[PDB]
Amino acid sequence: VPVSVDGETLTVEAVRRVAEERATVDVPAESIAKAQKSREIFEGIAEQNIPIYGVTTGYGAMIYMQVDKSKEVELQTNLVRSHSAGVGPLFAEDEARAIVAARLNTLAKGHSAVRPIILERLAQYLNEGITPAIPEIGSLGDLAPLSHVASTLIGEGYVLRDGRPVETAQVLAERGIEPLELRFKEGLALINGTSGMTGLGSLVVGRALEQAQQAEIVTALLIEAVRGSTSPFLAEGHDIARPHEGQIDTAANMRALMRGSGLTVEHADLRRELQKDKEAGKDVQRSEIYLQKAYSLRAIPQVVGAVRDTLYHARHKLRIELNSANDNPLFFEGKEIFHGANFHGQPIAFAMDFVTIALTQLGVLAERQINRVLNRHLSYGLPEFLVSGDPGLHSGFAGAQYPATALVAENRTIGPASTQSVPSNGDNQDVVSMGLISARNARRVLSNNNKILAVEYLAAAQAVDISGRFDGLSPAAKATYEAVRRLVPTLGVDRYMADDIELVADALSRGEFLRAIARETDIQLR
Amino acid sequence: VPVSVDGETLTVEAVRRVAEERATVDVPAESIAKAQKSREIFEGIAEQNIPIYGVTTGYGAMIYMQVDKSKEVELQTNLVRSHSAGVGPLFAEDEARAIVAARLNTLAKGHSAVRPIILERLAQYLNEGITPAIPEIGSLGDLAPLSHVASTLIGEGYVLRDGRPVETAQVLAERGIEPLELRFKEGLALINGTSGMTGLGSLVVGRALEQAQQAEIVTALLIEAVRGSTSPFLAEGHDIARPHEGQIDTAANMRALMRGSGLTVEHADLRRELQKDKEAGKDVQRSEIYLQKAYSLRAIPQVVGAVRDTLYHARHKLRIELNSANDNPLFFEGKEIFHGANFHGQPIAFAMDFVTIALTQLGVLAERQINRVLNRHLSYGLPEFLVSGDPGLHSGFAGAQYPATALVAENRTIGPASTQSVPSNGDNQDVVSMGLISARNARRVLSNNNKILAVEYLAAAQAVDISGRFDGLSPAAKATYEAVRRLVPTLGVDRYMADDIELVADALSRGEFLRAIARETDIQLR
């Protein structure tokens, strides 16, 4: 029942459990062995005063400075402190945990030549609930953020408790723990990695996929509410015509979500109803029936499908990175110490940047879907703005759309950060990834999307009441509707909406709608 | 040697060699008979005069309008004409050909229900040097762009002639061909797809892969000419510590490039040299030896690899799109007319936007490399800006580095377009992909990168004969160095640089350096 951080199997979903659910983390005895053993071979090497970066030489540009092994502890200590210069807000408990969890798993791969105590210590914090106070800003892609974490391993820096930072020492005494003392290369192996962006990015992509599911969930409800066609979700057009993985998944998810609905119609019905409306004598015939529907309710598989692909690619990279020795230098039995740049988070930087873009478009789609039901000219017969009473006198959902519309614009002002490298440290770092910035951007767009989806969920439910097509809703649709109605009542007369939207946005955040679907239906969502 | 457009096996490279090398295109009778199978049943359905988007109805928001069969011809004609609102510059011959192919390969799938003569007419044009005049702007992701290619088939619009356009009516009769007639679904099937972004992206991604190869090529020459370390490219540092596909591919390419070099140095020896330079004691010493070279010379596998992974994914989505039925509606046997949205180039929109970002970081790395070699402090001994004679009097490459630095900034000004959807057509197209814009974006950064590498190649060659390290160069470096001089002589004294730069860039775009290796060397670069 405990998460296994062996540095080879760790998954994104598992990182969330540890970060969010608090799942316990255990370092297999086999890993500790590879560590303890490797810690002995490496120690013997450094014990000869041999040139080894971050162990017997300066840091970064100062690699030209040779340090005698006599200052083994000071070298690693001065590093953690001098580099503990993070600024800005502190990371959320869950975020901070994902970060540490990613680092623990990094050194656990048995290539950082660290003592087991370090692995045990990190694990202790994750289990005993000792969350380090990690400043969001500082890493160039993740020295600063990781330096603040490492600081807590020696009884320094700050620990996060109730959103506020508290001296690590005072907290250790309260827990009875005795601060550790960094050893040969111990301080460098703790901060030198992509754990910051990998842990944060892990949570995002994980939740991103949940957001994708919840997007399809509400989209299905809306489709049934407006009585759209199902043809656009037939397997033939995807599994065959367009074999895009993500596209096929979305289409399949929609097909199941709308299973058993008396609202949705099939092409064979639209053409049947159309060929009958043309009852007119001949020629150019103007009909009130639409053989199809706007892209917002037709190209769902393609758009959300492309979003899924990006997410898959991200999870893949995130998976590989999680189980990789992002560190330097690296030790390898019967080999010279590896001196490269595995701390560089370009792969994750590019990934998160892509999630930001992908997520932005997911929000674009939802926003336009909201605009659809609110537009009397595009609502397919629904009252303008879903007003149940007297229009004009009541605005209905008119004011509820702006926050969603305003969000699409905001999300569009977030540009990729993985290409914004700036040379620092005597040019020694002439090319960086800025991965942590990319991960945070993705998190913002993700967060914003919840608020947009909140307006879409409320609108849908409202649409259901207005049209009075609840008894026509499918099994999954009914669950979605009720899941929303349980949080927010139908909009009869105009009223304060701010709280209503924040309420559903929170629910969507906790994957509350994806839940109601699993426990209320036999539906299995991809 | 001909390439077959069957709609299932067509590859990116095939598209390149077809649009570039003027390769011949073959449509296996299998696909022909499939289009027949389709073209046979469908036409029958249209005979029943039953509703069918584009075939017996309006387009977009005009879907409510129903067109009686008696106008099968006109309808398909008005659409192609009125939608021929392409503006901006005209695509190049290869670009266009690359698009016309993508459209043929799509119709070859056999779900577009178009007459086989359509695939025969398209497959011909490509084989008979008849390229249409495609305006670059107008597609929302690609009616307009494809509306022009469809115009030439009906003997209308303009065809590409020596850079300029010319009435298709003149060229046709000037070849022995007579305009065609568009039957039901013929005009909509020709313009209702993502051939623009897919065809354009294909070339870009294909050329991008070579850039990565050529980026690695010169990078190796520089590392050698600067006497860098090999540790960074060791196999263990990747296949074991960080098994990122691209990262592994890059780390393997660098080893084969600097394979057997006299200028390169092994860590063991670096470690042994430094050690000897250290005086006994328990203090800190200052050395001139660098155990580790700067990021621009040690983080290639990570950065360039991240790019590779992005190009890999992009090539993947393209290969799927290339062989997908990106049309609408779709015709299958035993099934109803699938009315979906596979014309939505979202899958490629994201793909290309991702390429733009990746290739941008690639330029950042290359540029910082040019800076690393031109800065006497980061040159590692090389003279100021590689000045052959007396400095101050001669600037050397000082003025050359400016265009490269400037290009890095210009590239950063290109933002993602796949998220810039703008509603139109009575809200019928509430969500688009702007995929064609995304593809151009990558095409620009790709072209810009050629100039960046051009300055890097020249600078690198200069560094070589500036320190007299040619004899130390390895088999591959020599080949690379040789390729440079064959076009541009070594810089003896200040002189016009524009030509030399544009010359090396024009060569890079052709892949002169990538080939020089496969031949003069035998190296099979990934």
* Domain termination residue (choose one: B164, B193, B222): B193
Q: For residue A422, how many other CB atoms are within 10 A of its CB?
A: 11
Q: Rounded to 10 degrees, what is the CA torsion of A19, A25, A30, A32?
A: 80
Find, in chain B, the residue whose alpha carbon is nearest to that of A335: B236
DSSP state of A293: -
Query: Cβ distance B304 to B216 under 8 Å?
Result: yes
Residues B151, B273: one domain? no
B148 annotated to a ligand binding site = no
Domain boundary among B193, B211, B226: B193
Q: Among A359, A431, A437, pick the best mutation site for testing chain B contact (most B Cβ within 10 A).
A: A431
Q: Which of B243, B285, B346 is opposite residue A324, by nearest beta carbon?
A: B243
Contacts A–B by Cβ distance under 8 A: 353
C-alpha B277, offset from chain centre: 49
Q: Which of B193, B208, B232 is the last residue of a domain?
A: B193
Phi, psi of A88 (to 5 degrees): 90, -165
Q: Which of B266, B271, B325 sits opposite A241 (nearest CB)?
A: B325
B283 and B168 share one domain? no
Q: Which of residues 452-481 of B touch A (CB under 8 A)?
A: none
Which residues have C-beta within 8 Å of that of residue B174, sequence separation ≥ 6?
A: none
Cα–chain center distance at B421: 23
SS3 A161: strand
Of residues A211, A434, A197, the one with CA closest to residue A317: A197
Mutate one of A62, A140, A346 to test the B interface: name it (highest B CB count within 10 A): A346
Option in B320, B358, B416 nearest A357 (CB):
B416
Do the beta carbons of residue A320 and residue B243 sit within 8 Å? Answer: yes
Cβ proximity of B204 and B443 under 8 Å? yes
Spatial separation of the C-alpha atoms in residues A272 and A266, rounded to whole Å? 10
Backbone dihedral angles phi then psi of residue A497, each to the nearest 5 degrees: -105, -30
Nearest CA in chain B to A234: B338
> Checking DSSP bridges between strand A164-167 and strand A158-161, what pairing results, if any?
antiparallel
Known active-site residue B53: yes
- Pure H helices in A413-434: none
**Do residues B242 and B382 both lie within one domain?**
yes
**Nearest to residue B223, comparing CAs of B252, B253, B265?**
B265
R_g over Cα of chain A: 27
Per the structure, the count of domains in chain A is 2
**Burial of B176 (C-beta count, 10 Å sphere; 0-12/13-18/19+):** exposed
Coil, strand or helix: which one is B487?
Answer: coil
CATH number of the domain at A378, please: 1.20.200.10
What's A178's DSSP letter? P
Write phi, then psi, for A132 (nearest 5 degrees).
-75, 150
Query: Helix, strand, or coil here: A43?
Result: helix
Same domain, B306 and B406: yes
Sign of CA dihedral B201, B206, B211, B216: positive
Residues B187 and B280 in one domain: no
Write the CATH number for B10: 1.10.275.10
Question: Same structural domain for residues A362 and A474?
Answer: yes
Among candidate residues B342, B313, B360, B307, the one with its CA nearest the CA of residue A358: B313
Phi, psi for residue A85 in degrees, rounded to 5:
-125, 35
Nearest to B366 by CA among B266, B438, B299, B291: B299
| Residue A323 among known ligand-binding residues | no
Using an 8 Å CB-CB cutoff, list chain B residues near A246: 347
CB B340 within 8 A of CB B330: yes
Q: How far is CA B127 from CA B22, B34, B105, in A?
A: 7, 22, 14
Q: How many CA atoms lie within 13 A of A65 on its CB side?
A: 11
Please name which of B57, B176, B180, B202 lies closest in space to residue B114, comparing C-alpha atoms: B180
Among A327, A72, A34, which Cα is nearest to A183's? Answer: A72
SS3 A328: coil
The count of other CB atoms within 10 Å of the CB of residue A40 is: 11
Contact B297, B222 (CB under 8 A): yes
Stated length of chain A? 526
Place of tokens 């809306």: A222
User: Look-up: residue for tokens 């405990």?
Assistant: A2
Amino acid letter, residue A80: V
Asked if residue B415 and residue B280 are part of one domain, the reply reads: yes
Q: Does B299 touch chain A (CB under 8 A)?
A: yes
Count of all residues that appear for chain B in the document: 526
Task: Return all residues near B499 (Cβ < 8 A) that are at least 6 apart.
Answer: none
Distance, in Å, from the CA atom of A426 to the CA atom of B371, rounded to the nearest integer, reads 13
Same domain (yes/no): B110, B236:
no
Residues B515, B408 share a domain: yes
Chain B contact present for A38, CB below 8 A: no
> How many Å apart are CA A132 and CA A134, to the nearest integer?
6
Given an 8 Å threshold on Cβ–Cβ distance, is B361 in contact with A346? yes
Whole-number Cα distances in Å, B278 to A53, A54, A125, B285: 15, 16, 40, 7
SS3 B90: strand
Residues B212 and B304 in one domain: yes
Q: Does B317 touch chain A (CB under 8 A)?
A: yes
A324 in contact with chain B, both atoms CB, cutoff 8 A? yes
**Within 10 Å of residue B64's Cβ, how many Cβ atoms?**
16
B422 alpha carbon, distance to own chain's centre? 26
Distance CA B406, CA B363 (A): 11
Distance CA A245, CA B194 (A): 18
**Do B98 and B311 meet the contact criterion of CB atoms below 8 Å apart?**
no
CA A205 to CA A12: how far, in whole Å?
8
Q: What stretches of A375-434 show up as alpha helix (H) in DSSP?
A: 398-412
> Where are the strands (E) in A321-379, listed by range?
none
Q: Identity (one letter) of the amino acid at B71?
A: K
CB contact under 8 A, A357 and B289: no
Are B139 and B199 part of one and the same domain? no
CB contact under 8 A, A65 and B286: yes
| H or E segment and range at residue A146 | helix A143-153
CB neighbour class for B381 (10 Å; exposed up to 12, middle 13-18, buried from 19)? exposed
Q: What span, in angstroms and rounded, lies between the C-alpha atoms of B499 and B526?
A: 31
Of the partner residues B364, B377, B420, the one whose CB lies closest to the CB of residue A419: B364
Both tokens assigned to B143 = 């009616």
Distances in Å between the Cα of B470 and the Cα atoms of A203, B265, B340 are: 51, 16, 61
* CA distance to partner chain A, nearest, from residue B192 (Å): 14
Question: Quick check: B368 and A234 CB within 8 A?
Answer: no
Nearest CA in chain B to A244: B320
- Same domain, yes or no: A397 and A496: yes
Angle between helices A143-153 and A116-128 (to 10 degrees): 90
C-alpha B4/C-alpha A377 separation (Å) is 47
Residue A39 sits in which domain range? Answer: 1-193
Max alpha carbon distance in chain B (Å)?
Answer: 99
Q: Rounded to the nearest 5°, which phi and psi values hold at A91?
A: -65, 150
CA–CA separation, A148 and A153 (whole Å): 9
Contact assessment for residue A352 and residue A439, using Cβ atoms and an 8 Å cutoff: yes
Q: Does A62 touch chain B (CB under 8 A)?
A: no
Cβ–Cβ below 8 Å for A292 and B63: yes
A237–B330: do the CB atoms touch at under 8 Å?
yes
**In angstroms, rounded to a whole number, what is the distance separating the alpha carbons of residues A419 and A200?**
19
> CA-CA-CA-CA torsion for A162, A163, A166, A169, nearest 10 degrees?
70
Distance of CA B28 to the CA centre of its chain: 27
Angle at A342 between CA A41 and CA B251, to 5 degrees: 100
Question: Contacts for B396-399 with beta carbons within 8 Å, 24 or more apart?
Answer: B396/B462, B396/B491, B396/B494, B397/B455, B397/B458, B397/B459, B397/B462, B397/B491, B398/B374, B399/B497
**Structure method:** X-ray
Is B183 annotated as a binding-site member?
A: no
Between positions 137 and 166 of A, the ones with CB within 8 A of B are none
Taking the CA of residue B219 as centre, how many other CA atoms within 13 Å lie in the half-sphere pointing to its CB? 31
CB-CB neighbors (< 8 A) of B326 in chain A: 242
What residues have CB less than 8 Å from A108, skipping those under 6 apart?
A5, A6, A7, A27, A31, A35, A119
Q: Which of A143, A226, A242 to mutate to test the interface with B (most CBs of B within 10 A)?
A: A242
**Block residue for tokens 């998160």:** A352
- Terminal-to-terminal C-alpha distance of chain B: 23
C-alpha distance from residue A100 to each of A20, A187, A248 (Å): 13, 14, 36
Q: Is the peptide bond before A416 cis (omega within 30 degrees of 0)?
A: no
